[PDB]
């Protein structure tokens, strides 16, 4: 559900043969050295390793320390660059990363506007704002990417871009 | 398998007539005497002796204790100085020869993908990655050959291979 999986992280590319205790000790040490821990003690409570598919799940004692540990993505552990991700059934709340897109040509329809956006990744929400009586586009839209990490990429790739006689605006809607 | 040779050592210059039990007793006693054990009990599980060529292999219960026993090179047994070495197939960096196989037709199952790989020799590890929900192949797999010397020939033979619709990507997984 909406509040599920908030204290766990997926860790991929773990070093071959590593133990759960070693992984646990490494992350707890890094949390402390890196200044990511928010109270005395160990933020990582447990590590569950799948040796066959070479991945682990970390369980944290708190929601906010789980979030902080996302910053370890790519950290090198016994020669291996670790892949750190949210669990697949973790989701931010609806609208958390809604985008505003302004400066669109009024003659473009929904699908045409969406084509520009979906080049960065799939969308879980989209609406092109139209005049209700005439059905004509007002030249701005909102969207949300399935993968929320795509949000900053769309902004970086589209914001301030030339588009016809306009300069496109793409920013977080709140 | 990979770690299997991480728990063995070669012993040379063994005196004539020595038994496997006497050798096992000797090394367990040495490990305990040196304070080199990381748990109660016996670190050496088994000894295999070749009387004709005057050598033995030791098998240990743990990777760390095997590494500790490297310190016994030159140790005196029945008046003779023993030669202690890693097995020739010892892997200093574990997983160095794990392969990634990508671009597989998504209808192929475990045995079919293995049939492609085993033409170059027997595997010690294999897994085809599947969607846990549907049980359907994601179109990539990992493996490890029993003989790591075969690895580069497999890459040479399989990488870039046209497989019906598909082109295979075969490389060290890292």
- For residue A41, what are the contacts with CB-CB under 8 A and spacing of at least 6? A61
Interface membership of A16 toward B (CB under 8 Å) = yes
Interface membership of A12 toward B (CB under 8 Å) = no
Closest CA to B46 of B77, B29, B25, B74: B25
Closest CA to A34 of A73, A71, A7: A71
Asked whether residue B101 falls in the same domain as residue B144, the answer is yes
Asked whether residue A86 falls in the same domain as residue A21, the answer is yes
d(CA B48, CA B54): 11
Interface membership of B142 toward A (CB under 8 Å) = yes
Q: Contact, B62 vs B4, CB < 8 A? A: no
8 Å CB contact of B63 and A15: no
Asked whether residue A38 falls in the same domain as residue A118, the answer is no
d(CA A165, CA A140): 15
Q: Contact, A131 vs A138, CB < 8 A? A: yes
The CATH number covering residue B19 comes to 3.30.70.330
The parent domain of residue B140 ranges over 93-148
Asked whether residue B131 falls in the same domain as residue B157, the answer is no
Asked whether residue B21 falls in the same domain as residue B81, the answer is yes
Q: Contact, B140 vs B80, CB < 8 A? A: no
Question: Which residues in B lie closer than 8 A to residue A18 (C-beta atoms)?
Answer: none
Closest CA to A126 of A173, A88, A163, A162: A173
Which structure tokens are listed for A166?
A: 């306009």
Asked whether residue A45 falls in the same domain as residue A114, the answer is no
Which structure tokens are listed for A29?
A: 């040490």
Number of domain units in chain B: 2
d(CA A146, CA A77): 30
What 8-state DSSP symbol labels residue A14?
A: P
């Amino acid at each position: 559900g909406p509040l599920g999986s908030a204290r766990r992280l997926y860790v991929g590319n773990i070093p071959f043969g590593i133990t759960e205790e070693a992984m646990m000790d490494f992350f707890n040490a890094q949390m402390r050295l890196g200044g990511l821990t928010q109270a005395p003690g160990n933020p990582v409570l447990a590590v569950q390793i799948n040796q066959d598919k070479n991945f682990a799940f970390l369980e944290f004692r708190s929601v906010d320390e789980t979030t902080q540990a996302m910053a370890f993505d790519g950290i090198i552990f016994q020669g291996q660059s670790l892949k750190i991700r949210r669990p697949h059934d973790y989701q931010p709340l609806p609208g958390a990363h809604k985008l505003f897109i302004g400066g669109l040509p009024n003659y473009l329809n929904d699908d045409q506007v969406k084509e520009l956006l979906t080049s960065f990744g799939p969308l879980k929400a989209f609406n092109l704002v139209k005049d209700s009586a005439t059905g004509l586009s007002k030249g701005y839209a909102f969207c949300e990417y399935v993968d929320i990490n795509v949000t900053d990429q769309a902004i970086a790739g589209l914001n301030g871009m030339q588009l016809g006689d306009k300069k496109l605006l793409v920013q977080r809607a709140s």
